[PDB]
Design a protein around this ligand. Structure first.
Ligand SMILES: COc1cc(/C=C/C=O)ccc1O
Length: 328
Protein backbone atom coordinates (compact mmCIF):
# COMPACT_ATOMS: atom_id res chain seq x y z
CA UNK A 1 0.00 0.00 0.00
CA UNK A 2 0.95 3.68 -0.14
CA UNK A 3 3.31 5.09 2.48
CA UNK A 4 1.50 7.44 4.87
CA UNK A 5 2.19 11.18 5.06
CA UNK A 6 1.70 13.98 7.65
CA UNK A 7 1.73 17.77 7.30
CA UNK A 8 5.02 19.05 8.70
CA UNK A 9 3.15 21.97 10.34
CA UNK A 10 -0.21 22.54 12.00
CA UNK A 11 -0.51 18.79 12.11
CA UNK A 12 -2.67 18.53 15.22
CA UNK A 13 -4.63 21.79 15.18
CA UNK A 14 -8.04 20.11 14.79
CA UNK A 15 -7.21 17.34 17.27
CA UNK A 16 -6.88 19.91 20.06
CA UNK A 17 -9.74 22.15 18.95
CA UNK A 18 -13.17 21.43 20.41
CA UNK A 19 -15.15 18.95 18.28
CA UNK A 20 -17.69 21.62 17.27
CA UNK A 21 -14.88 23.41 15.40
CA UNK A 22 -14.35 20.75 12.72
CA UNK A 23 -17.47 18.59 13.02
CA UNK A 24 -19.34 20.64 10.43
CA UNK A 25 -22.05 18.00 9.93
CA UNK A 26 -23.45 18.98 13.32
CA UNK A 27 -23.27 22.72 12.66
CA UNK A 28 -26.52 24.61 13.17
CA UNK A 29 -26.91 27.42 10.65
CA UNK A 30 -28.00 30.79 11.97
CA UNK A 31 -30.28 32.29 9.33
CA UNK A 32 -30.62 36.00 8.63
CA UNK A 33 -33.47 37.88 6.98
CA UNK A 34 -33.66 37.13 3.28
CA UNK A 35 -35.54 40.37 2.57
CA UNK A 36 -32.53 42.41 3.74
CA UNK A 37 -30.88 41.78 0.37
CA UNK A 38 -31.91 42.96 -3.07
CA UNK A 39 -30.19 41.29 -6.05
CA UNK A 40 -28.83 43.85 -8.54
CA UNK A 41 -26.96 41.95 -11.24
CA UNK A 42 -25.67 38.46 -11.91
CA UNK A 43 -21.88 38.33 -11.84
CA UNK A 44 -21.34 34.71 -12.76
CA UNK A 45 -22.30 31.06 -12.62
CA UNK A 46 -19.91 28.40 -11.41
CA UNK A 47 -20.18 24.64 -11.07
CA UNK A 48 -21.67 25.01 -7.60
CA UNK A 49 -23.20 28.49 -7.30
CA UNK A 50 -24.54 31.63 -8.93
CA UNK A 51 -23.01 34.88 -7.77
CA UNK A 52 -24.78 38.24 -7.66
CA UNK A 53 -24.04 41.79 -6.77
CA UNK A 54 -26.68 42.88 -4.27
CA UNK A 55 -27.61 45.70 -1.95
CA UNK A 56 -28.11 45.28 1.76
CA UNK A 57 -31.13 47.55 2.21
CA UNK A 58 -30.49 47.88 5.96
CA UNK A 59 -27.32 49.91 5.26
CA UNK A 60 -27.55 50.51 1.49
CA UNK A 61 -24.11 48.91 1.15
CA UNK A 62 -23.12 46.65 -1.73
CA UNK A 63 -22.69 42.97 -0.94
CA UNK A 64 -22.11 39.79 -2.90
CA UNK A 65 -24.70 37.05 -2.74
CA UNK A 66 -23.68 33.51 -3.54
CA UNK A 67 -26.68 31.26 -4.13
CA UNK A 68 -25.60 27.67 -3.76
CA UNK A 69 -26.74 25.06 -6.28
CA UNK A 70 -28.26 21.88 -4.85
CA UNK A 71 -25.40 19.80 -3.41
CA UNK A 72 -25.07 17.62 -0.26
CA UNK A 73 -25.99 19.43 2.99
CA UNK A 74 -22.56 18.45 4.25
CA UNK A 75 -20.63 20.24 1.47
CA UNK A 76 -22.87 23.22 2.15
CA UNK A 77 -22.35 23.01 5.92
CA UNK A 78 -18.63 22.46 5.35
CA UNK A 79 -18.23 25.73 3.47
CA UNK A 80 -20.37 27.64 5.98
CA UNK A 81 -18.48 26.29 8.99
CA UNK A 82 -15.11 26.99 7.39
CA UNK A 83 -16.14 30.56 6.53
CA UNK A 84 -17.34 31.12 10.10
CA UNK A 85 -14.14 29.64 11.51
CA UNK A 86 -11.94 31.85 9.34
CA UNK A 87 -13.98 35.07 9.56
CA UNK A 88 -11.86 38.11 10.43
CA UNK A 89 -8.63 36.44 9.38
CA UNK A 90 -6.17 38.28 7.12
CA UNK A 91 -7.41 38.59 3.52
CA UNK A 92 -10.15 35.99 4.07
CA UNK A 93 -13.44 36.93 2.37
CA UNK A 94 -15.91 37.91 5.10
CA UNK A 95 -19.17 36.00 5.39
CA UNK A 96 -21.67 38.64 6.51
CA UNK A 97 -24.90 36.64 6.54
CA UNK A 98 -26.61 33.43 5.45
CA UNK A 99 -30.17 33.44 4.19
CA UNK A 100 -32.65 30.98 2.68
CA UNK A 101 -33.35 31.80 -0.94
CA UNK A 102 -37.07 31.20 -1.54
CA UNK A 103 -36.64 30.49 -5.28
CA UNK A 104 -33.65 28.20 -5.23
CA UNK A 105 -34.64 26.61 -1.91
CA UNK A 106 -30.94 26.63 -1.02
CA UNK A 107 -28.69 28.79 1.18
CA UNK A 108 -27.52 32.15 -0.13
CA UNK A 109 -24.20 33.22 1.40
CA UNK A 110 -23.78 36.97 1.81
CA UNK A 111 -20.24 38.35 1.59
CA UNK A 112 -18.50 41.68 1.91
CA UNK A 113 -18.31 43.38 -1.47
CA UNK A 114 -14.91 43.58 -3.14
CA UNK A 115 -14.60 46.03 -6.02
CA UNK A 116 -12.27 43.75 -7.90
CA UNK A 117 -10.12 44.79 -10.82
CA UNK A 118 -10.94 42.20 -13.48
CA UNK A 119 -8.21 39.62 -13.77
CA UNK A 120 -7.02 40.17 -17.34
CA UNK A 121 -6.38 43.87 -16.72
CA UNK A 122 -4.62 42.74 -13.55
CA UNK A 123 -2.24 40.18 -14.97
CA UNK A 124 -1.22 42.29 -17.93
CA UNK A 125 -0.40 45.35 -15.79
CA UNK A 126 0.94 44.10 -12.44
CA UNK A 127 4.51 45.26 -11.85
CA UNK A 128 7.34 43.30 -10.27
CA UNK A 129 6.58 45.13 -7.03
CA UNK A 130 2.83 44.49 -7.37
CA UNK A 131 3.40 40.76 -7.80
CA UNK A 132 5.57 40.55 -4.68
CA UNK A 133 3.05 42.61 -2.69
CA UNK A 134 0.05 40.53 -3.68
CA UNK A 135 1.87 37.22 -3.25
CA UNK A 136 2.66 38.26 0.33
CA UNK A 137 -1.02 39.11 0.86
CA UNK A 138 -2.08 35.66 -0.43
CA UNK A 139 0.44 34.04 1.91
CA UNK A 140 -1.12 35.81 4.89
CA UNK A 141 -4.46 34.24 3.97
CA UNK A 142 -2.97 30.76 3.45
CA UNK A 143 -0.90 30.72 6.63
CA UNK A 144 -4.01 31.85 8.47
CA UNK A 145 -6.28 29.13 7.14
CA UNK A 146 -3.56 26.44 7.45
CA UNK A 147 -2.88 27.53 11.04
CA UNK A 148 -6.64 27.11 11.60
CA UNK A 149 -6.57 23.53 10.33
CA UNK A 150 -8.02 24.23 6.90
CA UNK A 151 -6.73 23.74 3.36
CA UNK A 152 -8.30 25.75 0.53
CA UNK A 153 -7.75 23.20 -2.29
CA UNK A 154 -8.81 25.58 -5.07
CA UNK A 155 -6.16 28.29 -5.18
CA UNK A 156 -6.19 29.87 -8.66
CA UNK A 157 -6.32 33.42 -10.08
CA UNK A 158 -10.12 33.54 -10.27
CA UNK A 159 -10.34 32.91 -6.53
CA UNK A 160 -8.03 35.78 -5.63
CA UNK A 161 -10.08 38.97 -5.74
CA UNK A 162 -8.04 42.15 -5.93
CA UNK A 163 -9.23 45.73 -5.62
CA UNK A 164 -6.10 47.25 -7.13
CA UNK A 165 -7.18 50.81 -6.30
CA UNK A 166 -7.06 50.13 -2.56
CA UNK A 167 -4.40 47.42 -2.84
CA UNK A 168 -6.88 45.07 -1.20
CA UNK A 169 -6.96 41.29 -1.64
CA UNK A 170 -9.44 38.57 -0.66
CA UNK A 171 -9.20 34.81 -1.04
CA UNK A 172 -12.67 33.55 -2.05
CA UNK A 173 -14.71 30.40 -2.87
CA UNK A 174 -14.09 28.12 0.09
CA UNK A 175 -16.50 25.59 -1.44
CA UNK A 176 -13.75 22.99 -1.92
CA UNK A 177 -11.97 23.73 1.37
CA UNK A 178 -11.47 20.97 3.94
CA UNK A 179 -10.36 20.39 7.51
CA UNK A 180 -6.94 18.73 7.73
CA UNK A 181 -6.85 15.62 9.91
CA UNK A 182 -3.61 13.62 10.11
CA UNK A 183 -3.89 10.32 8.26
CA UNK A 184 -7.13 11.24 6.51
CA UNK A 185 -7.54 10.33 2.85
CA UNK A 186 -9.07 13.06 0.68
CA UNK A 187 -10.70 13.31 -2.74
CA UNK A 188 -8.08 14.01 -5.41
CA UNK A 189 -10.72 15.55 -7.71
CA UNK A 190 -10.13 19.04 -6.32
CA UNK A 191 -8.59 22.26 -7.77
CA UNK A 192 -8.56 23.47 -11.38
CA UNK A 193 -6.52 21.29 -13.79
CA UNK A 194 -3.66 23.77 -14.26
CA UNK A 195 -3.23 24.20 -10.50
CA UNK A 196 -3.50 20.56 -9.44
CA UNK A 197 -0.53 19.35 -7.40
CA UNK A 198 1.42 16.24 -8.44
CA UNK A 199 -0.15 14.44 -5.44
CA UNK A 200 -3.56 14.82 -7.07
CA UNK A 201 -2.30 13.80 -10.50
CA UNK A 202 -0.77 10.55 -9.20
CA UNK A 203 -3.83 9.75 -7.01
CA UNK A 204 -2.09 10.17 -3.65
CA UNK A 205 -4.92 10.85 -1.21
CA UNK A 206 -3.13 11.59 2.08
CA UNK A 207 -2.23 15.18 1.20
CA UNK A 208 -2.33 18.39 3.23
CA UNK A 209 -1.95 22.20 3.30
CA UNK A 210 1.06 21.87 1.01
CA UNK A 211 -1.31 21.32 -1.93
CA UNK A 212 -2.15 25.04 -1.78
CA UNK A 213 1.54 25.91 -2.02
CA UNK A 214 1.87 24.04 -5.35
CA UNK A 215 -1.14 25.93 -6.66
CA UNK A 216 0.43 29.20 -5.46
CA UNK A 217 3.64 28.30 -7.26
CA UNK A 218 1.70 27.76 -10.49
CA UNK A 219 0.19 31.23 -10.12
CA UNK A 220 3.62 32.76 -9.44
CA UNK A 221 5.14 31.10 -12.51
CA UNK A 222 2.32 32.38 -14.73
CA UNK A 223 2.81 35.95 -13.46
CA UNK A 224 6.59 36.32 -13.54
CA UNK A 225 6.98 34.45 -16.87
CA UNK A 226 3.83 35.89 -18.45
CA UNK A 227 2.45 32.53 -19.49
CA UNK A 228 -1.06 31.82 -18.20
CA UNK A 229 -1.57 29.14 -17.27
CA UNK A 230 2.00 27.99 -16.85
CA UNK A 231 1.46 24.21 -16.99
CA UNK A 232 -1.14 24.00 -19.76
CA UNK A 233 -2.30 20.39 -19.91
CA UNK A 234 -5.07 19.16 -22.20
CA UNK A 235 -6.30 16.72 -19.53
CA UNK A 236 -5.15 15.44 -16.12
CA UNK A 237 -2.64 13.02 -17.66
CA UNK A 238 -1.08 15.51 -20.02
CA UNK A 239 -1.00 17.91 -17.05
CA UNK A 240 1.52 15.67 -15.28
CA UNK A 241 3.52 15.28 -18.48
CA UNK A 242 3.71 19.08 -18.79
CA UNK A 243 5.05 19.30 -15.23
CA UNK A 244 7.53 16.46 -15.89
CA UNK A 245 8.97 18.27 -18.93
CA UNK A 246 10.01 21.01 -16.51
CA UNK A 247 10.78 19.27 -13.20
CA UNK A 248 12.12 16.16 -14.98
CA UNK A 249 11.08 12.53 -14.85
CA UNK A 250 13.77 11.19 -12.51
CA UNK A 251 12.51 13.33 -9.60
CA UNK A 252 8.94 12.29 -10.44
CA UNK A 253 10.01 8.67 -10.02
CA UNK A 254 11.83 9.59 -6.79
CA UNK A 255 8.56 11.10 -5.54
CA UNK A 256 6.29 8.18 -6.32
CA UNK A 257 8.94 5.72 -5.07
CA UNK A 258 9.15 7.54 -1.73
CA UNK A 259 5.43 7.03 -1.14
CA UNK A 260 5.26 3.64 -2.87
CA UNK A 261 2.87 5.13 -5.49
CA UNK A 262 2.45 3.59 -8.98
CA UNK A 263 1.74 5.73 -12.03
CA UNK A 264 -1.31 4.92 -14.13
CA UNK A 265 0.05 2.54 -16.79
CA UNK A 266 -1.40 4.88 -19.43
CA UNK A 267 1.65 7.08 -18.75
CA UNK A 268 3.96 4.38 -20.18
CA UNK A 269 3.66 5.73 -23.72
CA UNK A 270 3.12 9.45 -23.09
CA UNK A 271 5.50 10.37 -20.26
CA UNK A 272 8.90 9.86 -21.88
CA UNK A 273 12.22 10.82 -20.27
CA UNK A 274 12.95 14.46 -19.40
CA UNK A 275 15.77 16.26 -17.68
CA UNK A 276 15.03 18.82 -14.97
CA UNK A 277 15.20 22.32 -16.47
CA UNK A 278 16.71 25.49 -15.04
CA UNK A 279 14.12 28.24 -14.54
CA UNK A 280 16.20 30.73 -16.56
CA UNK A 281 15.01 28.89 -19.69
CA UNK A 282 11.62 30.64 -19.36
CA UNK A 283 13.06 34.15 -19.12
CA UNK A 284 12.89 36.39 -22.16
CA UNK A 285 12.87 40.07 -23.06
CA UNK A 286 9.11 40.40 -22.48
CA UNK A 287 9.12 39.02 -18.94
CA UNK A 288 12.64 39.74 -17.65
CA UNK A 289 11.52 42.81 -15.65
CA UNK A 290 9.41 40.45 -13.49
CA UNK A 291 12.23 38.00 -12.87
CA UNK A 292 14.98 38.16 -10.27
CA UNK A 293 17.25 35.59 -8.67
CA UNK A 294 15.02 35.82 -5.60
CA UNK A 295 11.87 35.17 -7.68
CA UNK A 296 13.36 32.08 -9.27
CA UNK A 297 14.60 30.61 -5.99
CA UNK A 298 11.23 31.21 -4.32
CA UNK A 299 9.42 29.61 -7.27
CA UNK A 300 11.86 26.70 -7.22
CA UNK A 301 11.07 26.08 -3.54
CA UNK A 302 7.26 26.08 -4.10
CA UNK A 303 7.20 23.80 -7.14
CA UNK A 304 8.47 20.50 -5.70
CA UNK A 305 6.95 17.13 -6.59
CA UNK A 306 7.27 16.09 -2.96
CA UNK A 307 4.52 17.89 -1.05
CA UNK A 308 6.61 17.44 2.13
CA UNK A 309 9.48 19.43 0.54
CA UNK A 310 7.57 22.58 -0.43
CA UNK A 311 7.87 25.81 1.52
CA UNK A 312 5.12 26.25 4.07
CA UNK A 313 3.17 29.51 3.90
CA UNK A 314 5.07 30.78 6.95
CA UNK A 315 8.45 29.75 5.50
CA UNK A 316 7.50 31.41 2.21
CA UNK A 317 6.88 34.72 4.03
CA UNK A 318 10.47 34.57 5.31
CA UNK A 319 11.87 34.42 1.74
CA UNK A 320 14.24 37.14 0.43
CA UNK A 321 11.81 37.68 -2.50
CA UNK A 322 9.70 39.72 -0.06
CA UNK A 323 12.50 41.84 1.38
CA UNK A 324 11.65 44.76 -0.95
CA UNK A 325 7.93 44.70 -0.05
CA UNK A 326 7.02 47.41 2.44
CA UNK A 327 5.75 45.83 5.64
CA UNK A 328 2.80 47.49 7.36
C1 LIG B 1 -17.70 31.91 -6.14
O1 LIG B 1 -17.47 32.02 -4.74
C2 LIG B 1 -17.37 33.30 -4.18
C3 LIG B 1 -17.41 34.49 -4.93
C4 LIG B 1 -17.31 35.71 -4.28
C5 LIG B 1 -17.35 37.03 -5.03
C6 LIG B 1 -17.36 37.08 -6.37
C7 LIG B 1 -17.40 38.44 -7.02
O2 LIG B 1 -17.48 38.54 -8.23
C8 LIG B 1 -17.18 35.78 -2.90
C9 LIG B 1 -17.12 34.62 -2.16
C10 LIG B 1 -17.23 33.40 -2.80
O3 LIG B 1 -17.19 32.20 -2.09
Amino acid sequence: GPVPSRARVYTDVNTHRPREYWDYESHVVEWGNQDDYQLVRKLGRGKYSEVFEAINITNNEKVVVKILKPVKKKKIKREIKILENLRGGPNIITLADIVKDPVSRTPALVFEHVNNTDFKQLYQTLTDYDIRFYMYEILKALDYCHSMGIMHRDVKPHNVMIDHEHRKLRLIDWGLAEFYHPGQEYNVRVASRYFKGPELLVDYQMYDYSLDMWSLGCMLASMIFRKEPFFHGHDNYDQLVRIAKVLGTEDLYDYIDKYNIELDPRFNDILGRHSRKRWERFVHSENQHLVSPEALDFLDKLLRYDHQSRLTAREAMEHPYFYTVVKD
